[PDB]
């Protein structure tokens, strides 16, 4: 996870000499297993738009 954050959008951990991405509550890991997908209209940590 040392560089590029394991290509993870949010959390990165090394599970068995291998990169594992994960996300904050209110998000779901995307098919690519790197991006994080919000579950609702106001997911945590995102600035709001009208």
């Amino acid at each position: 996870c040392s560089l590029d954050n394991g290509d993870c959008d949010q959390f990165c951990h090394e599970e068995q000499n291998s990169v594992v991405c994960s996300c904050a509550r209110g998000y779901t890991l995307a098919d690519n297993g790197k991006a994080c997908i919000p579950t609702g209209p106001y997911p945590c940590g995102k600035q709001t738009l009208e």
Partner: protein
């Protein structure tokens, strides 16, 4: 906030304001979820009774989105003491849930190890609030934000009259006249990673505001992630 600028609509949605009986703001808070607000333990000593306002950006005008919430439970860290200002953290459970909307959304809580190695190593964080715009000056009627660089723990300790503990971290500028200030206390310090903002600190204390050779001191949220999780599960 000294220096910095006014937040735009939806730019600092996790900001909360603690208001006293006089309906006057005296500390900030950070929205963690529909029922919980993160703030500083020292703030709880200022007003016997207080409520929480969310969605406000101008305290002199009532605008769409502002809402007031009563606090149901106050969970103050049992090791907080004004002697050292260590463990300056508290969680508030509200009586009724916050409805997220434009200007009202929670900041994300990060995973501990990742936050320590990836978030706390970023160059800057963002602090915001309705506090004084100058040391001993008037509180801001508008919500302000300020980008503040993380400061090396050792440089900070050398600059400080008081002990900097592992439950704190420093941020700000040596001489540039920008800093958080009294009144911003309890408020959010967030760090953006890619396109998500994570709460990393709680505005805690400082010697004056924006003083040359002094920095802003924040409660290090990563040190309390398990405490927060336990506190949030009633």
């Amino acid at each position: 906030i000294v220096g910095g600028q006014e937040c735009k609509d939806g730019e600092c949605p996790w900001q909360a304001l603690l208001i006293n009986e006089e309906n006057e703001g005296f500390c900030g808070g950070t929205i963690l979820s529909e029922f919980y607000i993160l703030t500083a333990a020292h703030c709880l000593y200022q007003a016997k009774r207080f409520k929480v306002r969310v969605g406000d950006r101008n305290t002199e005008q009532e605008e769409g989105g502002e809402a007031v919430h009563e606090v149901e439970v106050v969970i103050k860290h049992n090791r907080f003491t004004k002697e050292t200002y260590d463990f300056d953290i508290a969680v508030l459970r509200l009586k009724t849930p916050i409805t997220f909307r434009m200007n009202v959304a929670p900041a994300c809580l990060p995973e501990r190890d990742w936050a320590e190695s990836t978030l706390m190593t970023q160059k800057t964080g963002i602090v915001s609030g309705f506090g004084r715009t100058h040391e001993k000056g008037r509180q801001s009627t508008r919500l302000k934000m300020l980008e503040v660089p993380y400061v090396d723990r050792n440089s900070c300790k050398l600059s400080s009259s008081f002990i900097i503990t592992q439950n704190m971290f420093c941020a700000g500028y040596d001489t540039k006249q920008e800093d958080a200030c009294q009144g911003d206390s309890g408020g959010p310090h967030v760090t953006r990673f890619k396109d998500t903002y994570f709460v990393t600190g709680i505005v805690s204390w400082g010697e004056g505001c924006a003083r040359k050779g002094k920095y802003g001191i924040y409660t290090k949220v990563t040190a309390f992630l398990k405490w927060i999780d336990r506190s949030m599960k009633t």
